[PDB]
Every structure is written in C-alpha cells, then in structure tokens.
C-alpha cells in the first residue's frame, strides 16, 4: 500500500549549525527576534502540511538565516557573548538568573552596534 | 548485556508472581508479591511512568503491610506454614517456571507464539515512541488533570471512600 | 449508555476521557490522534453494524498505529534475514550502523 | 568514577553512624551530669571502634524457633533501605537528580515496616511479636501525617524535584512560612524513628526491646545502623526542608558546610529531646496523632493549598 | 504485542489460577486477589504511557483506589470469620450448608 | 448569644486543637472566593507558554494579531512585570 | 565541660562533610569544570543529546562556540 | 544503570555485612541455648498464637486514609492548571471528605482504639 | 444498624447501580459495580449471625473475582482498540471474558453456586434486595453490549441457568433457597432472549422484578423461612396465603396470569428468528419450576396443615409494619396480560 517519498540523501544535506546549548540559550531572545520570519513560516509549514517532506526548503531557509545571524554576531561583540555563554554553561540548568552582569554587557553591544 | 533488562524486569515479575500464587505460607505469598511489585515498578518506570511507579511503590508497600497486619493477628496459628511444608507447592512452583520458559523459548525461535493472542518475541524496546515533552512530564500532567477534568472521578471516589469507612465501621462493629 | 442523562440534561460527565483525540491537558496529543480522528469522523451517524465495514481500512490502520503488530513483525523479519546472512557472512553494515 | 562517588556516599555515612553512637553517649551523659566515654582513646573517640569489633566478633545466636530466611533478610532490608534512602539528598549537587526525589524518599521511608514485621515475627518471641505490631502501627500511623505535611510544604515549592527545594527557600527559611507544620513534621519524624519520647517499642518494662530482642551481634547491630542512620537522614531532610541555606554555584562547599551544621544541630535536638522527656504510652501515642495531630495537619494542608491561589503566588512547576 | 505484555498477562492468568484455585487459605487467596489487581494496574499503565493517553494517566490510581478498598473489606471480613471460627482455613467454612 | 460564646470559649479550652483546625480550615475555603488576586493567579497560569504559539496563516484583515513578534499590538503581560 | 563533646561531633561533622564536596567536585571534575547539566524534562535531554552530537567527542560537557562554525 | 548501580552497590554491601556477621564468629553450638526467652523465663507456649486484638480498626483505617492520600498526592502538579477555581473547590472537597471520614471515625468510636 | 446509616447504605447501593446504567465510560461502569459491592456487604451483615458472615464472605469472593475479570475484559478491549466507550467489542476473548465476569455477578452458569447459599445466609429483606436490585446493573451492561456477544455462549449459559435453576429447587424446603433457584431459572429465561432483542429481556426483567417483590413482601408478611413454617401460616393469614397461592400460580406462567406473558413473548421472538428447538427446552423445563411451585402451594393454601396450640395467641396480635406497595405489587404481578402491547413503550 504505497512505498515511500523519502527525499534523496542530497536533499536533506544542509550545513548543520554546530553550536552548543549554552551558546544557543545565550543568543535566544535576540536570535528569535531577528530570525522569527523563517522560523515562523517553517513551522507554519510544519503544522499546516503536517509533513516535513514538504518543508525541507523552509528548513534550509531557517538554517541559513540563523547562520547569517550567527555570522553577524561573530563579526561584532563576541567576547561579551563568549563570557555570557560560558557563564550560562557553568549553570547546571542554563539559568539566566546568575548571568545578569554579562547579560547587560551583551545586550548593549547588539544594541549600539547591530 | 543490560539490553534485555526491560524484558527481564517482566520475567522476574512472572516467576515472583507464581511463588506468590503458589499458595505458600501467607507471608511467602506476600514476599512473592513484594518482589513482583518491586520489579514491576521498574517496568512502569523505564517506560516513563516515574510518578505512577513510585505511587504503586508507596501505596502497595503499605497495602501488603496491612494485609500482614492481620496475618500475624488473624491468620497465624501454632505451626505457621513454611514455603517447603506442603509437597504440592513445589509442583505448582515448577509448573510456574516451565510454561513461560517454553513460551519465551518459542518466541526466541519463531517470534510468532500462538498462545491466546498474537505476540512477537522481538524484545520491547521497539514499541517506544520518538518525540519530546517540552518542559512538562506527560504522566505527571495527566494525573494532575484529575482536579480539572476529573470532575466525576474524584467525586465518586471520595464518596466511595466515605462509604468504605462507613462499611468498615459497620461490619467490624461487633454489635 | 442505557439511560444517557449526559446529553439529555446537557453536560459531560465521563465523555471527556473516553477517546484520546479530545482536548488533552495543554494540547498533548495522543500517539494515534490522526488515525482515531480519521476513524471517528469516518464513522459518525452511520450505525455500528454499517460503519464497521465502510470504516474498516481506517480501523485497522488505527489498530496498527496502537499496537504496531504488522510493523514490528516486518522489523523482526528484517532482523532475522540480516542476522542470518551476517552469520553466514556476505556483507558488512555501513559505518553509519557502527559509528 | 561514578562508583567512587557512591562509595564516597556510603562509607562516610557509615563513619557518621558509628560516631553517632559516641556523641549520643557523650551528649546524654553531659545532659545528666556524666562525663561520658573518654577512656577509649582521646575523649572516647576510639570507643565506637571497640564496640563494633565486639559486636562483629560476638556470637550471633540463631533463634532456634525461627526461619533463618527472614532472620537474615530483615537486617538486609533495614540497612540497605536506610543507606539507599540517602541517595537523592540535595547536597549542593545531589548524587541522583530524581525528578520525584521527595516522593522517592518518602516511599522508601515506609519500607522500615518491612524490616520491623519480619524481625518481630521471625524471631518468634512474645516481646518480639508484641513489639512488631505495636511499632508497625506507630510508624504506619505517623507515615500518613508525614505524607500530608510533605504535600502541604511542597505546594509552595513547585514540584517533587528535591534539588529545586533550595531555590524555593533562598531568601527566607521555609520554617518561617510553615512553622506550625514543621513543628508537627519534626515530631512525627521523632515518632517514625522510634525515639525515647515516642519509641514505645523498647519499653524496658513490658516490651524490653520489641523488635531487636533475639537479634544478636551482627544482624542486631545492622538494625541499630539502620535506626541511627534514619536519625541523620531525617534530620537532614528536615534541615533542607525548613532550615534553608545559601548556595553559590561557584562555591559548592558553602552549602555543604551549612547543611552539615544544620544536620548536626537537628540531631543534637533529637538527643536533647530524648535525654529529658518521659516515654509515651501506646494509648496516648496513637491518641496524639489520631485525635490531635491529624485534624491540625488536614486543616494546615487546606490552608497551604488555598494560600498560593489567593496570593497569586503559585510556585513555578519547572 | 511484545514480551512485556505477555509477561503481565501471563502473571494475571496465574494470579487467576492461584486465587480461584483455592488451596486451603482465605488470607492467601485474597492476597492473590490483590496481586491480581497489581498485574492489571501495571498492564493498564503500559498502554496508557505508551499511547500518550494523557487523560487516562489518571485511570490507574483511580483503578487503584477502589481495588484496595475491596481488600480493605476483604481482610476486614477475614477477621469476622476468624474470631468465631478461629482461623482463615476454609474447610471448616461449612456452617452454611442448606 | 451567651451560650454560643461560652461554647466557643470551652472549645478553645477543652479541645484547643479542634478549634484551631476548624478555624484555619474555615478560612481556607472562604478566603479564595473573597480574595481579589485569584484571577491574577489564573492570569499567571495562562501566561506560561508550555507549548509553541503556532502562528496563523496571514491573509489580511487580522489587525489584532501582530505581524511580527516585536510588534506593539497583541497580548501583553506588563501586569506580570509589575506584579 | 561541654567541649569534650566537641571532638565527638567534629569527626562526625567531617563524616557528613565528605559526601558534600565529593559529589560536588566529581561532577565539576567530570563535566569539564561545569556542574552537571540536570535533565528534568525531555527538552533538556534533547539539548544534551544535540550537544553530545555536535561535540564530536561523545562528551556533552565539551562545548564549542562560534569559532566552531563559519 | 546509574541509579540501578547505586541500588546494587548498597544491597551487596549490606549482604557482605550480614555475611561477616553470621559467619565470622564461632559458636560452640550447644542445645540449651535454643531455649527461648521472656525476661528470665521462656515464652511458655505462645509467641505464635492468634493475637486477639482491637487496634485492627486503626490498622485498616490507615489503609483507607492512605488511598485518599494517594488521591491528593498529584496536587503540586495540579495547582499548575488554567481553571484554578475548579481545582480549588474540588481539592477542598477531597480534604473535607478526609475530615468527614475522620469525624465519623471519631464520634462512632472507630479511631478510638477499641477495648 | 443506625437507621440513617442503613439509609445511606440504601442509596449508595442504588447510586452504584445508577452509575452503571447512566455512565458511558467503561471505568465508570466498573466503579459503579464495586460501589454496589462495597455498599451491599454491610446490609447483608445487618443481622450479624455466622450464617450472615458466611453469605457475605461468599458474595464478596465471587463478586470481587467477577469484577476483576470485568477489568480484564476492560483492559483487553482498551488494548486492542484504545476506546473506553461501551459498545461492540473489538477483541473476541475480551467479549467472552466480560461475559463470564458479568455472569458470575448474575449467577447464570456454574458461576451460580453462590446465590442459593448467600440467599440462605441473609435475612429475607436482604434477600429481596439481593435478588431484585443486584441484577439491574449486569443486565444493563449486557443490554449495552448485545451487538457482539457469542450467541452460542449466551444461549448455552442461559440454558444451564434455567436447567439447574429448575433442578436445584426440587430438593429444597427453605423458602429462601427455592426462591434463589427460581431466580436462577428466571435469569436463564431473560438471558436466553438477551442476544436476540433486549426489549423482551427488559420486559421479563420487569415482570420477574415485580413478582419478586410481590413474593418476598408476602414472605416477611407471613414471617416464614421453611415450608413447614409457611404451612403453619395457613391459619393466621388466610388472605395472605391465598395471595401466596395466586402469585405462586403466576410463578410458572399459567395463563392468563402475568408470568405467562414474558414466556410467551420470549418464545414468539425466538421463533421469529428460526430458533424453534431452543424455546421448547425452557418451555418443558418450566414444569420443573411449576413442580416445587405446586409443592409450596399445597403446603400453603390448598391443603390445611396442622397448626399449633400456642399459635392461637398470635390471633390476638396484628401485623403493625405496613410494608407498603404490597397491594399494587400483587396486582401488577397477577393481571397485566391484557396490557401486553405496552411492551412497545420500553422499545
Ligand atoms: C417498582 C419500584 C418500587 C418498589 C417498591 C416496593 C419494594 C421496595 C421495598 C419494600 C417497600 C415497602 C417497605 O415497607 O419498605 C421498608 C421495609 C422495612 O425496612 P427493613 O429494612 O425491611 O426493616 C427495618 C425497618 O426499616 C426499621 O428501620 P431500620 O432503622 O431498621 O432501617 C431504616 C429504614 C429506613 O428508615 C428511614 O428513616 C427511611 O430502612 C429501610 O427502610 C431499608 C432500605 C434502606 C433505607 C431506606 C431508604 C429507601 C430509599 O423494607 C422492606 O420492605 C425491604 C427492605 C429494603 C427496601 C428497599 C429496597 C430497594 C430495592 C428493591 C427493588 C426496587 C425496584 C427495582 C426495580
Ligand atoms: C581489620 C580489623 C580491625 C578493624 C578495626 C580498625 C583497626 C583496629 C583498631 C585500631 C585503633 C585501636 C587500636 C587499639 C587501641 C587501644 O587498645 O588503646 C588505644 C589507646 C587508648 O588508651 P587508654 O586510655 O585505653 O589506656 C588505658 C587507660 N587506663 C589505664 C586508665 C585504663 O590510645 C592509643 O594507643 C593512642 C592512639 C589512639 C588513636 C589515635 C587517633 C585518635 C583520633 C582519631 C580517631 C578516629 C579515627 C581512627
Ligand atoms: C382464587 C382463590 C385462591 C385460593 C383458594 C383457596 C383458599 C381459600 C381460603 C382459605 C382460608 C379460609 C378462610 O377462612 O379465609 C378467610 C379469609 C378472610 O375472610 P374474608 O375477609 O371474608 O375474605 C374475603 C373478603 N371479604 O378469606 C379468604 O381467605 C378467602 C380468599 C381471600 C382472597 C381472595 C381470593 C384470591 C384473590 C387473588
């Protein structure tokens, strides 16, 4: 009763954004605010089609947009991001509570530079 | 290999049940039930049922406590039975061991055991489901829904427990 | 039910839990929400002894979603052949299957 | 190195229990004008070693009118449960982060009945058979109060994760919010460990010992180890539950020191209570909880479940 | 249907045998009866955790709460035959004959 | 009048635990209805997004729904910040 | 002369002292200086698994920042 | 694994203690030691007779209360619900039923330890 | 037994049955079943005699086992369909399992040795309760699941029900015992037509019910437990013993009395559906019921029995407990045949 639709191994080949959980949680709010549109449309596709085989292109778009965002933050203040993500990493729950100092030190850069 | 533990957890459940149902001394049936429940708590736990597993742990290891409470009160005698006293209990026990052993041997050879229903001998790890839970345990949230969606359930239960304490009063009242 | 007071006097008393596509707490869908939605909306106002045959393919698809009897049997056959030919030694699993 | 961490959990608890048998004989004596043991080594520091060696090399008598299976299993249960019930405790980083640690440990707390009953019946003596049922009734009838107290206290914590309990207290000691509750909880703890005010099982006039009568030497000492390990474990439980402490993640040692000091203080309060008070009677013992403790506990639980709702201060679930 | 289902179903079948096939004891029989509900409790929890039946997660404890109640009276009945008759041995349990 | 007050006094003396429990319990039911913050607790519970707010397919004429997650219009919880 | 009790509980304190840092240090020892990343919910477990996969050394506590990516 | 490893370590450790306890010491194994004990005497012909008792009622009301304690256990998770009003009323029902069962236990002798 | 406690036991039994015939979730059906079980044990122990303890113990064991097998059927059809709604079963062995689980609660098949004994043990009012009210719930469940019941199973089970119901009552003098056996026979009677059309088993349930109250109220209006004790009551209550006789005629189903109508209806619909051999078996075996019915009639009213000298001062005392509904209770159980079309009301 039917066979498959699995896209080719070449189809699901994207640059997998290879960063750590602490880095990702440190970016978080800024990353979401500046990359919502590809993410929003991607999972609108996911919930509407109920079918990831129809939403690979959305996945490529969100990956590439997030990667661009990470490239811009690399181009600018990264040492505050470095300290921030390291401090978040030290937390066993990735708690935002015990990082506020570096949080300010981060939030100012992307505010006055990006 | 600790792969098959999710299998063996049930297996020790079975043969701890048989001796529990082998009609031995009442405390030895209790011991069989105790090891069966202790090993079945693992069966529910490794399936994700942390709260339900610990719940049955608590309530059931109190429940067999109370059934003990009369075993030394309203069930002992001059010569309490022993797990080796009667000769038939050994036969019951060994008939407990060889049946599921033969069936699992078949399920390891043919994987299509024909006993009662349809069963496959290919472990149990398959039947789990991929997915996620966000930041909430499904089991805990489901049992918490008792106070929001369990409209009738808590009402009828609490009424039944009230009637239960009433009947426990009345039958044991002794005129 | 025999005397369905539930829809007569107008409230749910137990129908909230009966099936698993109902409004689950915090929208936690069941394993077979899609299949049982298909089955339920297939057999609605049709009659059990009539709906059991029109809504058949949905029903066994639902049952196979619940139990995965056919799929796990297929996996068992695949594993059987794989272990047989590996013991009698023709090919080796690709590195994705080792590490 | 996981097993090394395990062993670093068991073994120090064993020395703690060992030297508790010295600190009690010193504290009690000083409370009743006695110098206490100070002959075996400096200030009696070596005394627990000598008694332990004696009890290991004392003859373990087999109860002739007994089935040896339970006579051996009951010490196993009592001792192993007592130690494994230390597993999920929030040291600054708890050993096992069990999501239901408090419920986990409360459930294991009920298992001491499963050593008491087999000890009392298998040994097959009048004192044993009496004390088994009496102590069983004690601990089971106080386990309920322990349960509602735990639930009512936790309703302000957020979950059954026992590591987040510290995060609950942080600012203020939790007793400041549930001092009426803790006052019951602590006392019920005193009841569950069978201590002089609430012991009722020893009763050295009509029960003598109650459960550890025919037990001799090693299996006998194992039940003492369980008993004086439950002391430390439940005093530590109460310490974190109500007597909170600071914990800076960059300095884990601080919370460790504060917590051990709290545990020592609470154990000293245990010894303090036992050195003064008379012993309850079974009639009054169950009158204390059925007639008095339980209604207050029910009402306090109702208060502590209604309170977060009306204050719009429900605790965070995760 | 994997081996865990076989094991708990088979445990229930032997609990049925043990309780229903009386040997000589009423207390041990109702003990087998309450083990029966333990087998059913585990069995019920299995599908419910398996299929993400979130509401039905509360059914086991519900199923539990009533079942112990049965034993709550069972052993309660056990004392009431015991004080008069003397034991729980069901072979003297014959007075009601005709 | 006098009988009720005398009975309360005797209960406060004879079984003090009973009166304390009955009192604090009787509060436990009647305050939550009286208190003006339980609705705020409902707001607390509805505020937490345990799951993703799956967006709606834009087709025009939904001014209420914000177009962007940084947009001004839409649900807000500044009361949460002040609380 | 209460200070005679002071040695008696002091070792006792040390006895309860050791389980404190031993668990605390070993965690810090095992997880690359970081404390243990508690996974109380499946999202935490998924994050830990993705960190382990990205690390490339089958060690979750090994973490690489933007220098790892383009 | 981890947790199971701790349980294994503890049970084996306990069993080593009991093994050293029961095997290391030496006993002459003479008959008259086996005579049982009661404050100087032996327990005559008892310590296994059926125990004519009364606090059986307390023992059974323990279990009956334990079921309801299990019922009210999910409360900390339950407080995190949208419809807090229904949860409040219905939990309050549960504790009120607890209290009512205790009160009926009280007035009708019941929890009063039978004589 | 505190009057208010007895009332609260009344209504928890009745509410346990109500939960059965109004709920849709299967778990709720089980809950009602054990609510009724937990509630009816104390009233059976109202007298508190060792016979009552015996009867209560046997009832508890039988019904607890039956409810556990009920949950087994429950769990199996949940496992094979994931639907708690009470409807046609989707696994055969689950259907069979529920069939014997309910039957043990009804006393139909060899799972019927409990009812005569438990009826012997308890007082006659508890007997009325047991043999009237504690049938409505299992019948209602069987009606709701009539879509898929193995017709062979239900038919043979009803056949033994009526057959051992007729045979067991022959060698019984205790009125409670012969009433239990008669109830077993009526159990077989309705359960035979249960698979074919549930309106007729509902009608037979109604007729058996009204006949059973009309019976038990006459017994404890005469205060008799043995056949000889009832025979001694031919004196004091001649009207009561004459009505005794007329309802004992309605017992077997002699026309034009009420008891003939359910037999007639069941046989007519069984013949509508090509079952022609089957009805003749109960038609013959109803004579087994009529036999000890006639024996009871002879001991009661048709033949005068030797009274006792002391018995005469009973003449000076009148029954004070009214025991209401008895007149209409007799009347509905005697003359309703010209109202047979009213069965369509139940449909
Ligand atoms: C068709 C549907 C209607 C049928 C009507 C006729 C059958 C019903 C039974 C007989 C009614 C006549 C009568 O006198 O009854 C009281 C009469 C006298 O009560 P008793 O328990 O025999 O003797 C003790 C006294 O009541 C002395 O008092 P006590 O303190 O010992 O007991 C308290 C008393 C009630 O006391 C009160 O204050 C009330 O208890 C009862 O009446 C027993 C039933 C439970 C409590 C009453 C609530 C009923 C609702 O009882 C009976 O005749 C039978 C006892 C059970 C009655 C209820 C049975 C219900 C189910 C039967 C089938 C119903 C139809 C199903 C389709
Ligand atoms: C393996 C099998 C054995 C397992 C147990 C451990 C090893 C054996 C025990 C080792 C210690 C005790 C050795 C015997 C000591 C003795 O007899 O007298 C000691 C004696 C005690 O002397 P004393 O006061 O008894 O002398 C007699 C006094 N009059 C005459 C008044 C009766 O002290 C010493 O020998 C000095 C050294 C003692 C120990 C020093 C450290 C103490 C502080 C740390 C304690 C906790 C960690 C240990
Ligand atoms: C049909 C009848 C079936 C039963 C026939 C056999 C029994 C006949 C009567 C035996 C007892 C004899 C006796 O002395 O009875 C006195 C009794 C009361 O007397 P009385 O009040 O006159 O009765 C009729 C109404 N006035 O009166 C009777 O007992 C007479 C019968 C009373 C009941 C009416 C007949 C049955 C109705 C159904």
Please tally the helical runs of chain F, counting DSSP H or I stretches of 4 or more residues.
4
Main sheet attributes: strand count, strand direction, barrel closure of chain H: none
β-strand percent of chain F reads: under 5%
The CATH homologous superfamily of chain H corresponds to NADH:ubiquinone/plastoquinone oxidoreductase, chain 3
Percent helix among the residues of chain F?
Answer: 55-70%
CATH class of chain H: Mainly Alpha
Provide structural commentary.
This is part of a larger assembly, with nine protein chains of nine kinds. Chain B has 175 residues and is an all-alpha fold. Chain B has one domain (5-173): NADH-ubiquinone/plastoquinone oxidoreductase chain 6, subunit NuoJ (Four Helix Bundle (Hemerythrin (Met), subunit A)). Chain B has helices at 5-21, 26-45, 50-71, 88-109, 138-144, 151-172. In chain D, 65% of the residues lie in helices and 0% in strands. Chain D contains eleven helices and no strands. Chain D has helices spanning 2-31, 47-56, 68-84, 101-109, 113-122, 126-154, 165-169, 175-192, 217-242, 252-274, 282-310. Chain F is mainly α. Helix content of chain F is 57%, strand content 0%. Chain F contains four helices and no strands. Chain H has a single domain (1-108), classed as NADH:ubiquinone/plastoquinone oxidoreductase, chain 3 (Methane Monooxygenase Hydroxylase, Chain G, domain 1). At the B-E interface, helix 1, helix 2, helix 3, helix 4 and helix 5 of B face helix 1, helix 2 and helix 3 of E. The complex binds cardiolipin, 1,2-diacyl-SN-glycero-3-phosphocholine (PC1) and 1,2-Distearoyl-sn-glycerophosphoethanolamine. The site of 1,2-diacyl-SN-glycero-3-phosphocholine has 8 residues of chain D, from helix 2. Cardiolipin binds next to helix 1, helix 6 and helix 10 of chain I. Chain H: Keywords: Electron transport, Membrane, Mitochondrion, Mitochondrion inner membrane, NAD, Respiratory chain, Translocase, Transmembrane, Transmembrane helix, Transport, Ubiquinone.
List keywords for this structure.
part of a larger assembly, 9 chains, D: 318 residues, mainly alpha, 11 helices, 65% helix, globular, I: 347 residues, 16 helices, binds cardiolipin, binds 1,2-diacyl-SN-glycero-3-phosphocholine, binds 1,2-Distearoyl-sn-glycerophosphoethanolamine, electron transport, in-situ cryo-EM structure
Q: How would you sum up this structure in a few lines?
A:
By secondary structure, chain C is mostly helical.
Give a topology summary.
This is part of a larger assembly, with 9 protein chains of 9 kinds.
Chain D: H1 2-31, H2 47-56, H3 68-84, H4 101-109, H5 113-122, H6 126-154, H7 165-169, H8 175-192, H9 217-242, H10 252-274, H11 282-310
Helix pairs in contact in D: 1-2, 1-9, 1-10, 3-5, 3-9, 5-6, 6-8, 6-11, 8-9, 9-10
Chain G: H1 5-30, H2 42-55
Chain H: H1 2-23, H2 56-72, H3 75-78, H4 84-107
Helix pairs in contact in H: 2-4
PDB class: electron transport
Keywords: in-situ cryo-EM structure, mitochondria
Entry title: In-situ complex I with Q10 (State-beta)
């Amino acid at each position: 009763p039917g066979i498959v639709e699995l896209p080719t191994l070449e189809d699901l080949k994207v640059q997998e954004v290879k960063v750590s959980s602490s880095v990702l949680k440190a970016a978080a709010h800024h990353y979401g605010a500046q990359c919502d549109k590809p993410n929003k449309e991607f999972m609108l596709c996911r919930w509407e089609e109920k079918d990831p085989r129809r939403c690979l292109e959305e996945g490529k778009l969100v990956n590439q947009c997030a990667l661009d965002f990470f490239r811009q933050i690399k181009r600018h203040c990264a040492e505050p991001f470095t300290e921030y993500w390291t401090c978040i990493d030290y937390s066993g729950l990735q708690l935002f509570r015990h990082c506020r100092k570096q949080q300010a030190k981060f939030d100012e850069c992307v505010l006055d530079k990006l | 290999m600790t792969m098959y533990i999710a299998f063996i957890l049930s297996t020790i459940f079975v043969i701890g049940f048989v001796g529990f149902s082998s009609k031995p001394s009442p405390i030895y049936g209790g011991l069989g039930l105790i090891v069966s429940g202790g090993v079945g708590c693992g069966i529910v736990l490794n399936f994700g049922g942390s709260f339900l597993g610990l719940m049955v742990f608590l309530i059931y290891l109190g429940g067999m406590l109370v059934v003990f409470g009369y075993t030394t009160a309203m069930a002992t005698e001059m010569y309490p039975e022993v797990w080796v006293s009667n000769k038939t209990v050994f036969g019951a026990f060994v008939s407990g061991l060889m049946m599921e052993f033969c069936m699992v041997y078949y399920a390891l050879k043919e994987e299509e055991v024909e006993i009662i229903f349809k069963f496959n001998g290919l472990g149990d790890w398959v039947i789990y489901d991929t997915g996620d839970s966000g930041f909430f345990s499904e089991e805990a949230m489901g049992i918490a829904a008792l106070y929001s969606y369990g409209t009738w359930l808590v009402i009828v239960t609490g009424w039944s427990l009230l009637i239960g304490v009433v009947v426990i009063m009345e039958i044991t009242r002794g005129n | 039910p025999f005397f369905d007071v539930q829809k007569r006097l107008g409230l749910d008393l137990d129908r909230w839990m009966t099936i698993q596509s109902a409004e689950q707490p915090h929208k936690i869908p069941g394993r077979c929400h899609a299949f049982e939605k298909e089955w339920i909306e297939c057999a609605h106002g049709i009659g059990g002894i009539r709906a059991e045959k029109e809504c058949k393919i949905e029903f066994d698809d639902f049952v196979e979603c619940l139990l995965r009897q056919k799929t796990m049997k297929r996996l068992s056959a695949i594993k059987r052949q794989r272990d047989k030919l590996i013991k009698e030694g023709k090919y080796t699993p690709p590195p994705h299957h080792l590490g | 190195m996981f097993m090394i961490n395990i062993l670093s959990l068991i073994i120090p608890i064993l020395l703690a229990v060992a030297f508790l048998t010295l600190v009690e004989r010193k504290v009690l004596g000083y409370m009743q004008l006695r110098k206490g043991p100070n002959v075996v080594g400096p200030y009696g520091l070596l005394q627990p070693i000598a008694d332990a060696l004696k009890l290991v090399t004392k003859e373990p008598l087999r109860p002739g009118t007994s089935s040896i299976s339970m006579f051996i299993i009951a010490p196993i249960l009592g001792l192993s449960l007592a130690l494994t019930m230390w597993v999920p405790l929030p040291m600054p980083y708890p050993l096992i982060n069990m999501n239901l640690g408090v419920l986990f440990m409360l459930a294991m707390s009920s298992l001491a009945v499963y050593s008491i009953l087999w000890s009392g019946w298998a040994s097959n003596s009048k004192y044993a058979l009496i004390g088994a049922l009496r102590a069983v009734a004690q601990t089971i009838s106080y386990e309920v109060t322990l349960a509602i107290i735990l639930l009512s206290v936790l309703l302000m914590n957020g979950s059954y994760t026992l590591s987040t309990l510290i995060t609950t207290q942080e600012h203020i000691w939790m007793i400041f919010t549930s001092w009426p509750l803790a006052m019951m909880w602590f006392i019920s703890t005193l009841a569950e460990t069978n201590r002089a005010p609430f012991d009722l099982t020893e009763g050295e006039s009509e029960l003598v010992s109650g459960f550890n009568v025919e037990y001799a030497a090693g299996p006998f000492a194992m039940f003492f180890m369980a008993e004086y390990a439950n002391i430390i474990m439940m005093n530590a439980f109460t310490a974190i539950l109500f007597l909170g402490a600071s914990h800076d993640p960059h300095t884990p040692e601080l919370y460790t020191i504060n917590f051990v000091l709290k545990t020592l203080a609470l154990t000293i309060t245990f010894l303090w209570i036992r050195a003064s008070y008379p012993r309850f009677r079974y009639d009054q013992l169950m009158h204390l909880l059925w007639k008095s403790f339980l209604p207050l506990t029910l009402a306090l639980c109702m208060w502590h479940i209604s309170l977060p709702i009306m204050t719009a201060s429900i605790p965070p679930q995760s | 249907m994997p081996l865990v289902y076989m094991n708990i179903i088979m445990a229930f079948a032997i609990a049925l045998a043990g309780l229903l096939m009386y040997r000589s004891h009423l207390m041990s029989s109702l003990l087998c009866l309450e083990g029966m509900m333990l087998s059913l409790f585990i069995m019920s929890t299995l599908i419910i955790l398996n299929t993400h039946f979130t509401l039905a997660n509360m059914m086991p404890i519900i199923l539990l709460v009533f079942a112990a109640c049965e034993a709550a009276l069972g052993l309660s009945l056990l004392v009431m035959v015991s004080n008069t008759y003397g034991t729980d041995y069901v072979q003297n349990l014959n007075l009601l004959q005709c | 009048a006098g009988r009720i007050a005398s009975f309360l006094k005797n209960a406060w003396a004879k079984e003090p635990v009973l009166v304390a429990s009955f009192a604090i319990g009787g509060l436990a039911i009647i305050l939550p209805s009286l208190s003006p913050y339980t609705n705020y607790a409902i707001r607390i519970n509805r505020a937490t997004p345990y799951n993703y707010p799956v967006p709606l397919r834009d087709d025009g004429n939904m001014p209420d729904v914000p177009s962007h997650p940084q947009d001004p219009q839409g649900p807000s919880l500044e009361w949460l910040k002040n609380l | 002369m209460w200070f005679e009790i002071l040695p008696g509980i002091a070792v006792m304190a040390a006895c309860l002292f050791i389980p404190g840092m031993a668990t605390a240090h070993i965690h810090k020892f095992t997880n690359g200086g970081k404390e243990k990343r508690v996974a109380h919910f499946s999202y935490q477990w998924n994050l830990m698994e993705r960190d382990r996969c990205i690390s490339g050394v089958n060690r979750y506590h090994v973490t690489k920042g933007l220098e790892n990516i383009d | 694994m981890n947790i199971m490893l701790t349980l294994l370590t503890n049970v084996t450790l306990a069993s080593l203690l009991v093994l050293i306890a029961f095997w290391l010491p030496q006993l002459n194994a003479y008959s008259e030691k086996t005579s049982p004990y009661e404050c100087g005497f032996d327990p005559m012909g008892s310590a296994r007779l059926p125990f004519s008792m009364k606090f059986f009622l307390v023992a059974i009301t323990f279990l009956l209360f334990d079921l309801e304690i299990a019922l009210l256990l999910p409360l900390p998770w339950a407080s995190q619900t949208n419809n807090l009003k229904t949860m409040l009323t219905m939990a309050l029902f549960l504790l009120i039923l607890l209290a009512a069962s205790l009160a009926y236990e009280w007035t009708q002798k019941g929890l009063e330890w039978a004589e | 037994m505190n009057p208010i406690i007895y009332t609260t036991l009344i209504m928890t039994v009745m509410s346990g049955t109500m939960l059965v015939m109004i709920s849709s979730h299967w778990l709720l059906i089980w809950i009602g079943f054990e609510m009724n079980l937990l509630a009816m044990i104390p009233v059976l122990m109202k007298n508190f005699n060792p016979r009552a303890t015996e009867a209560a113990t046997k009832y508890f064991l039988t019904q607890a086992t039956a409810s556990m097998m009920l949950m087994m059927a429950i769990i199996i059809n949940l496992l094979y369909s994931g639907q708690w709604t009470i409807t046609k079963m989707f696994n055969p062995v689950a259907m069979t399992m529920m069939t014997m689980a309910l039957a043990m609660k009804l006393g139909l098949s060899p799972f019927h040795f409990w009812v005569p004994e438990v009826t012997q043990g308890i007082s006659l009012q508890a007997g009325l309760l047991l043999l009237t009210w504690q049938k409505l719930a299992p019948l209602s469940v069987l009606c709701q699941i009539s879509q898929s019941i193995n017709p062979n199973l239900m038919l043979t089970m009803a056949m033994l029900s009526i057959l051992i119901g007729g045979w067991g009552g022959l060698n019984q003098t205790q009125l409670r015992k012969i009433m239990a056996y008669s109830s077993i026979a009526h159990m077989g009677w309705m359960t035979a037509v249960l698979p074919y059309n549930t309106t007729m088993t509902i009608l037979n349930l109604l007729i058996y019910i009204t006949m059973t109250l009309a019976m038990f109220m006459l017994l404890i209006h005469s205060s008799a437990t043995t056949t000889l004790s009832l025979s001694h009551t031919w004196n004091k209550m001649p009207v009561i013993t004459s009505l005794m006789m007329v309802t004992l005629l309605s017992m077997g189903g002699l026309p034009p009395l009420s008891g003939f109508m359910p037999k007639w209806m069941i046989i007519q619909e069984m013949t509508k559906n090509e079952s022609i051999i089957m009805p003749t078996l109960m038609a013959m075996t109803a004579l087994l019921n009529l036999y000890f019915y006639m024996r009871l009639a002879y001991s009661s009213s048709l033949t005068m029995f030797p009274s006792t000298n002391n018995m005469k001062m009973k003449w000076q005392f009148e029954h004070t407990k009214q025991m209401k509904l008895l007149p209409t209770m007799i009347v509905l159980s005697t003359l309703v045949l010209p109202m047979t079309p009213a069965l369509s009301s139940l449909n």
